[PDB]
């Protein structure tokens, strides 16, 4: 019943729109946010499509499902990803813009170079499957990085990168030191 914490940074590589059309924002700070659901759903679709080369246990067990029939609980809890303090300070001091509005309709985007702190929590529901689940999480990441988040994907927008990923057992004594994403 251990929990493993995956934390790191999501960096924007090309303008990010998650919804004339403003980007979604934290109510508390009015700063852009990447919702966990955005991340969850995109990683699920992508990893499903990957394996599909009728659901797959491996996708189900990490992400769960809201769909008919399913009872399987998600091992992987995905937080909202928040505008990093490092980003706020740097952009403030150097008069850098963290959003910009362009014509396609009028579209707000999070600027290249903005970074968000992210956090996944992994529940060890079945000790024998941790290694495989962690390979699959990694694969999901890589697929998201060779794809896109939110809108404007096909015109090259919404490219993000994961980096500085730290793995740590925050509940229980499960030995997670061998685990690595990248
Ligand atoms: Ca570690
Ligand atoms: Ca610990
Ligand atoms: Sm389905
Ligand atoms: Sm095996
Ligand atoms: Sm590996
Ligand atoms: Sm990459
Ligand atoms: Sm991809
Ligand atoms: Sm990376």
PDB file of C-alpha atoms and ligand atoms in Angstrom:
ATOM      1  CA  UNK A   1       0.000   0.000   0.000  1.00  0.00           C
ATOM      2  CA  UNK A   2       2.984   2.332  -0.678  1.00  0.00           C
ATOM      3  CA  UNK A   3       2.712   5.554  -2.653  1.00  0.00           C
ATOM      4  CA  UNK A   4       5.434   6.814  -5.009  1.00  0.00           C
ATOM      5  CA  UNK A   5       5.643  10.490  -5.948  1.00  0.00           C
ATOM      6  CA  UNK A   6       6.725  11.508  -9.456  1.00  0.00           C
ATOM      7  CA  UNK A   7       7.473  15.279  -9.600  1.00  0.00           C
ATOM      8  CA  UNK A   8       9.145  17.564 -12.115  1.00  0.00           C
ATOM      9  CA  UNK A   9       8.606  20.331 -14.591  1.00  0.00           C
ATOM     10  CA  UNK A  10       6.584  20.685 -17.728  1.00  0.00           C
ATOM     11  CA  UNK A  11       8.157  23.197 -20.083  1.00  0.00           C
ATOM     12  CA  UNK A  12       6.233  24.816 -22.929  1.00  0.00           C
ATOM     13  CA  UNK A  13       8.035  24.439 -26.272  1.00  0.00           C
ATOM     14  CA  UNK A  14       5.376  26.013 -28.501  1.00  0.00           C
ATOM     15  CA  UNK A  15       2.354  28.187 -27.482  1.00  0.00           C
ATOM     16  CA  UNK A  16      -0.105  26.232 -25.323  1.00  0.00           C
ATOM     17  CA  UNK A  17      -3.949  26.744 -25.447  1.00  0.00           C
ATOM     18  CA  UNK A  18      -6.036  24.661 -22.977  1.00  0.00           C
ATOM     19  CA  UNK A  19      -9.590  26.138 -22.923  1.00  0.00           C
ATOM     20  CA  UNK A  20     -12.638  34.822 -27.481  1.00  0.00           C
ATOM     21  CA  UNK A  21     -10.705  31.681 -26.332  1.00  0.00           C
ATOM     22  CA  UNK A  22      -8.691  32.366 -23.111  1.00  0.00           C
ATOM     23  CA  UNK A  23      -6.464  29.696 -21.476  1.00  0.00           C
ATOM     24  CA  UNK A  24      -7.578  27.954 -18.273  1.00  0.00           C
ATOM     25  CA  UNK A  25      -6.432  29.629 -15.052  1.00  0.00           C
ATOM     26  CA  UNK A  26      -6.072  28.950 -11.318  1.00  0.00           C
ATOM     27  CA  UNK A  27      -8.930  30.713  -9.516  1.00  0.00           C
ATOM     28  CA  UNK A  28      -6.609  31.502  -6.571  1.00  0.00           C
ATOM     29  CA  UNK A  29      -3.782  33.307  -8.447  1.00  0.00           C
ATOM     30  CA  UNK A  30      -5.355  33.955 -11.936  1.00  0.00           C
ATOM     31  CA  UNK A  31      -2.200  32.337 -13.413  1.00  0.00           C
ATOM     32  CA  UNK A  32      -2.305  29.760 -16.247  1.00  0.00           C
ATOM     33  CA  UNK A  33      -2.606  26.106 -15.166  1.00  0.00           C
ATOM     34  CA  UNK A  34      -2.304  22.759 -16.930  1.00  0.00           C
ATOM     35  CA  UNK A  35      -5.178  20.653 -15.449  1.00  0.00           C
ATOM     36  CA  UNK A  36      -4.430  17.091 -14.409  1.00  0.00           C
ATOM     37  CA  UNK A  37      -7.416  15.980 -16.541  1.00  0.00           C
ATOM     38  CA  UNK A  38      -5.788  17.533 -19.670  1.00  0.00           C
ATOM     39  CA  UNK A  39      -2.590  15.536 -18.892  1.00  0.00           C
ATOM     40  CA  UNK A  40      -4.421  12.383 -17.764  1.00  0.00           C
ATOM     41  CA  UNK A  41      -6.691  12.201 -20.799  1.00  0.00           C
ATOM     42  CA  UNK A  42      -4.033  12.899 -23.378  1.00  0.00           C
ATOM     43  CA  UNK A  43      -1.614  10.340 -21.906  1.00  0.00           C
ATOM     44  CA  UNK A  44      -4.462   7.782 -21.807  1.00  0.00           C
ATOM     45  CA  UNK A  45      -5.552   8.269 -25.438  1.00  0.00           C
ATOM     46  CA  UNK A  46      -1.963   8.188 -26.659  1.00  0.00           C
ATOM     47  CA  UNK A  47      -0.966   5.040 -24.740  1.00  0.00           C
ATOM     48  CA  UNK A  48      -4.207   3.311 -25.755  1.00  0.00           C
ATOM     49  CA  UNK A  49      -3.506   4.091 -29.453  1.00  0.00           C
ATOM     50  CA  UNK A  50       0.071   2.868 -28.953  1.00  0.00           C
ATOM     51  CA  UNK A  51      -0.943  -0.528 -27.577  1.00  0.00           C
ATOM     52  CA  UNK A  52      -3.853  -0.849 -30.083  1.00  0.00           C
ATOM     53  CA  UNK A  53      -1.159  -1.361 -32.760  1.00  0.00           C
ATOM     54  CA  UNK A  54     -12.113  -3.824 -25.943  1.00  0.00           C
ATOM     55  CA  UNK A  55      -9.729  -2.102 -23.473  1.00  0.00           C
ATOM     56  CA  UNK A  56      -6.146  -2.807 -22.328  1.00  0.00           C
ATOM     57  CA  UNK A  57      -5.461  -3.726 -18.652  1.00  0.00           C
ATOM     58  CA  UNK A  58      -2.185  -1.790 -18.771  1.00  0.00           C
ATOM     59  CA  UNK A  59      -3.857   1.512 -19.644  1.00  0.00           C
ATOM     60  CA  UNK A  60      -6.841   0.833 -17.394  1.00  0.00           C
ATOM     61  CA  UNK A  61      -4.792   0.075 -14.294  1.00  0.00           C
ATOM     62  CA  UNK A  62      -2.727   3.375 -14.510  1.00  0.00           C
ATOM     63  CA  UNK A  63      -5.439   5.830 -15.596  1.00  0.00           C
ATOM     64  CA  UNK A  64      -8.778   4.169 -14.783  1.00  0.00           C
ATOM     65  CA  UNK A  65     -11.854   4.955 -16.931  1.00  0.00           C
ATOM     66  CA  UNK A  66     -15.200   6.788 -16.639  1.00  0.00           C
ATOM     67  CA  UNK A  67     -16.683   4.413 -19.232  1.00  0.00           C
ATOM     68  CA  UNK A  68     -19.397   1.720 -19.031  1.00  0.00           C
ATOM     69  CA  UNK A  69     -18.445  -1.556 -17.320  1.00  0.00           C
ATOM     70  CA  UNK A  70     -15.161  -0.436 -15.777  1.00  0.00           C
ATOM     71  CA  UNK A  71     -14.474  -1.068 -12.046  1.00  0.00           C
ATOM     72  CA  UNK A  72     -10.628  -0.731 -12.202  1.00  0.00           C
ATOM     73  CA  UNK A  73      -9.255   2.060 -10.012  1.00  0.00           C
ATOM     74  CA  UNK A  74      -6.478   4.374 -11.252  1.00  0.00           C
ATOM     75  CA  UNK A  75      -3.054   3.726  -9.711  1.00  0.00           C
ATOM     76  CA  UNK A  76      -1.937   7.086 -11.072  1.00  0.00           C
ATOM     77  CA  UNK A  77      -3.267  10.324  -9.549  1.00  0.00           C
ATOM     78  CA  UNK A  78      -2.456  13.393 -11.644  1.00  0.00           C
ATOM     79  CA  UNK A  79      -2.390  16.874 -10.137  1.00  0.00           C
ATOM     80  CA  UNK A  80      -2.985  20.132 -11.895  1.00  0.00           C
ATOM     81  CA  UNK A  81       0.395  21.515 -12.996  1.00  0.00           C
ATOM     82  CA  UNK A  82       1.053  25.010 -11.616  1.00  0.00           C
ATOM     83  CA  UNK A  83       2.959  28.065 -12.867  1.00  0.00           C
ATOM     84  CA  UNK A  84       6.382  27.603 -11.244  1.00  0.00           C
ATOM     85  CA  UNK A  85       7.784  30.192  -8.858  1.00  0.00           C
ATOM     86  CA  UNK A  86      11.059  30.096 -10.833  1.00  0.00           C
ATOM     87  CA  UNK A  87       9.095  31.085 -13.946  1.00  0.00           C
ATOM     88  CA  UNK A  88       7.233  33.952 -12.164  1.00  0.00           C
ATOM     89  CA  UNK A  89      10.488  35.463 -10.824  1.00  0.00           C
ATOM     90  CA  UNK A  90      12.465  35.189 -14.108  1.00  0.00           C
ATOM     91  CA  UNK A  91       9.700  36.452 -16.408  1.00  0.00           C
ATOM     92  CA  UNK A  92       8.951  39.340 -13.973  1.00  0.00           C
ATOM     93  CA  UNK A  93      12.600  40.506 -13.741  1.00  0.00           C
ATOM     94  CA  UNK A  94      13.190  40.454 -17.531  1.00  0.00           C
ATOM     95  CA  UNK A  95       9.827  41.838 -18.765  1.00  0.00           C
ATOM     96  CA  UNK A  96       8.968  38.517 -20.534  1.00  0.00           C
ATOM     97  CA  UNK A  97       5.389  37.685 -21.444  1.00  0.00           C
ATOM     98  CA  UNK A  98       3.803  34.490 -20.103  1.00  0.00           C
ATOM     99  CA  UNK A  99       0.798  34.647 -22.461  1.00  0.00           C
ATOM    100  CA  UNK A 100       0.166  36.133 -25.887  1.00  0.00           C
ATOM    101  CA  UNK A 101      -2.866  36.464 -28.147  1.00  0.00           C
ATOM    102  CA  UNK A 102      -2.747  35.702 -31.914  1.00  0.00           C
ATOM    103  CA  UNK A 103      -5.225  35.292 -34.794  1.00  0.00           C
ATOM    104  CA  UNK A 104      -6.106  31.677 -35.831  1.00  0.00           C
ATOM    105  CA  UNK A 105     -10.817  33.811 -34.017  1.00  0.00           C
ATOM    106  CA  UNK A 106      -8.609  35.197 -31.203  1.00  0.00           C
ATOM    107  CA  UNK A 107      -6.458  32.626 -29.337  1.00  0.00           C
ATOM    108  CA  UNK A 108      -4.544  33.192 -26.073  1.00  0.00           C
ATOM    109  CA  UNK A 109      -1.488  30.912 -25.532  1.00  0.00           C
ATOM    110  CA  UNK A 110       1.027  30.175 -22.763  1.00  0.00           C
ATOM    111  CA  UNK A 111       4.421  31.306 -24.088  1.00  0.00           C
ATOM    112  CA  UNK A 112       7.406  29.134 -24.940  1.00  0.00           C
ATOM    113  CA  UNK A 113       9.694  28.870 -21.904  1.00  0.00           C
ATOM    114  CA  UNK A 114       6.947  28.976 -19.273  1.00  0.00           C
ATOM    115  CA  UNK A 115       7.404  26.096 -16.829  1.00  0.00           C
ATOM    116  CA  UNK A 116       4.916  24.307 -14.614  1.00  0.00           C
ATOM    117  CA  UNK A 117       5.565  22.119 -11.564  1.00  0.00           C
ATOM    118  CA  UNK A 118       3.880  18.718 -11.907  1.00  0.00           C
ATOM    119  CA  UNK A 119       3.084  15.899  -9.537  1.00  0.00           C
ATOM    120  CA  UNK A 120       1.857  12.375 -10.117  1.00  0.00           C
ATOM    121  CA  UNK A 121       1.185  10.035  -7.230  1.00  0.00           C
ATOM    122  CA  UNK A 122       1.460   6.287  -7.951  1.00  0.00           C
ATOM    123  CA  UNK A 123      -0.319   3.777  -5.701  1.00  0.00           C
ATOM    124  CA  UNK A 124       1.428   0.394  -5.299  1.00  0.00           C
ATOM    125  CA  UNK A 125      -1.791  -1.719  -5.551  1.00  0.00           C
ATOM    126  CA  UNK A 126       0.228  -4.696  -6.899  1.00  0.00           C
ATOM    127  CA  UNK A 127       3.966  -4.883  -6.118  1.00  0.00           C
ATOM    128  CA  UNK A 128       4.866  -7.179  -9.054  1.00  0.00           C
ATOM    129  CA  UNK A 129       3.671  -4.643 -11.671  1.00  0.00           C
ATOM    130  CA  UNK A 130       5.506  -1.452 -10.538  1.00  0.00           C
ATOM    131  CA  UNK A 131       8.417  -1.830 -13.007  1.00  0.00           C
ATOM    132  CA  UNK A 132       6.017  -2.400 -15.958  1.00  0.00           C
ATOM    133  CA  UNK A 133       3.687   0.429 -14.860  1.00  0.00           C
ATOM    134  CA  UNK A 134       6.724   2.722 -14.658  1.00  0.00           C
ATOM    135  CA  UNK A 135       7.900   1.728 -18.170  1.00  0.00           C
ATOM    136  CA  UNK A 136       4.351   2.438 -19.372  1.00  0.00           C
ATOM    137  CA  UNK A 137       4.232   5.848 -17.627  1.00  0.00           C
ATOM    138  CA  UNK A 138       7.519   6.686 -19.317  1.00  0.00           C
ATOM    139  CA  UNK A 139       6.133   5.566 -22.660  1.00  0.00           C
ATOM    140  CA  UNK A 140       2.997   7.681 -22.126  1.00  0.00           C
ATOM    141  CA  UNK A 141       5.287  10.699 -21.377  1.00  0.00           C
ATOM    142  CA  UNK A 142       7.419  10.183 -24.502  1.00  0.00           C
ATOM    143  CA  UNK A 143       4.285   9.828 -26.622  1.00  0.00           C
ATOM    144  CA  UNK A 144       2.934  13.133 -25.215  1.00  0.00           C
ATOM    145  CA  UNK A 145       6.247  14.817 -25.986  1.00  0.00           C
ATOM    146  CA  UNK A 146       6.201  13.614 -29.627  1.00  0.00           C
ATOM    147  CA  UNK A 147       2.591  14.853 -29.816  1.00  0.00           C
ATOM    148  CA  UNK A 148       0.883  17.893 -28.257  1.00  0.00           C
ATOM    149  CA  UNK A 149      -1.422  19.194 -25.532  1.00  0.00           C
ATOM    150  CA  UNK A 150      -4.657  21.208 -25.959  1.00  0.00           C
ATOM    151  CA  UNK A 151      -5.496  22.941 -29.275  1.00  0.00           C
ATOM    152  CA  UNK A 152      -3.564  23.856 -32.437  1.00  0.00           C
ATOM    153  CA  UNK A 153      -1.586  20.608 -32.418  1.00  0.00           C
ATOM    154  CA  UNK A 154      -1.534  20.047 -36.185  1.00  0.00           C
ATOM    155  CA  UNK A 155      -0.196  23.606 -36.853  1.00  0.00           C
ATOM    156  CA  UNK A 156       2.628  22.779 -34.380  1.00  0.00           C
ATOM    157  CA  UNK A 157       1.218  24.384 -31.197  1.00  0.00           C
ATOM    158  CA  UNK A 158       1.017  22.882 -27.705  1.00  0.00           C
ATOM    159  CA  UNK A 159       4.433  21.114 -27.676  1.00  0.00           C
ATOM    160  CA  UNK A 160       5.538  20.497 -24.078  1.00  0.00           C
ATOM    161  CA  UNK A 161       8.537  18.746 -22.438  1.00  0.00           C
ATOM    162  CA  UNK A 162       8.869  16.841 -19.184  1.00  0.00           C
ATOM    163  CA  UNK A 163      12.117  17.205 -17.238  1.00  0.00           C
ATOM    164  CA  UNK A 164      13.789  17.022 -13.817  1.00  0.00           C
ATOM    165  CA  UNK A 165      11.608  14.085 -12.870  1.00  0.00           C
ATOM    166  CA  UNK A 166      12.158  12.873  -9.323  1.00  0.00           C
ATOM    167  CA  UNK A 167      10.784   9.591  -7.974  1.00  0.00           C
ATOM    168  CA  UNK A 168      10.330   9.079  -4.224  1.00  0.00           C
ATOM    169  CA  UNK A 169       8.370   6.780  -1.902  1.00  0.00           C
ATOM    170  CA  UNK A 170       6.283   9.263   0.166  1.00  0.00           C
ATOM    171  CA  UNK A 171       4.125   6.568   1.858  1.00  0.00           C
ATOM    172  CA  UNK A 172       5.408   3.086   2.843  1.00  0.00           C
ATOM    173  CA  UNK A 173       8.836   1.452   2.482  1.00  0.00           C
ATOM    174  CA  UNK A 174       8.618   0.292  -1.162  1.00  0.00           C
ATOM    175  CA  UNK A 175      12.105   0.650  -2.606  1.00  0.00           C
ATOM    176  CA  UNK A 176      11.723   3.007  -5.567  1.00  0.00           C
ATOM    177  CA  UNK A 177      15.450   3.951  -5.959  1.00  0.00           C
ATOM    178  CA  UNK A 178      15.819   1.770  -9.140  1.00  0.00           C
ATOM    179  CA  UNK A 179      12.950   3.653 -10.864  1.00  0.00           C
ATOM    180  CA  UNK A 180      13.760   6.210 -13.533  1.00  0.00           C
ATOM    181  CA  UNK A 181      11.656   8.072 -16.062  1.00  0.00           C
ATOM    182  CA  UNK A 182      13.556   9.131 -19.249  1.00  0.00           C
TER     183      UNK A 182
HETATM  184 CA1  LIG B   1      14.489   8.264  -6.216  1.00  0.00          CA
HETATM  185 CA1  LIG B   2       9.488   7.914   2.272  1.00  0.00          CA
HETATM  186 SM1  LIG B   3     -12.827   2.432 -24.708  1.00  0.00          SM
HETATM  187 SM1  LIG B   4       8.007  -8.498 -17.487  1.00  0.00          SM
HETATM  188 SM1  LIG B   5      13.043   2.370 -19.112  1.00  0.00          SM
HETATM  189 SM1  LIG B   6      11.942  14.182 -25.706  1.00  0.00          SM
HETATM  190 SM1  LIG B   7       3.798  11.492 -29.509  1.00  0.00          SM
HETATM  191 SM1  LIG B   8      12.212  14.841 -21.399  1.00  0.00          SM
END
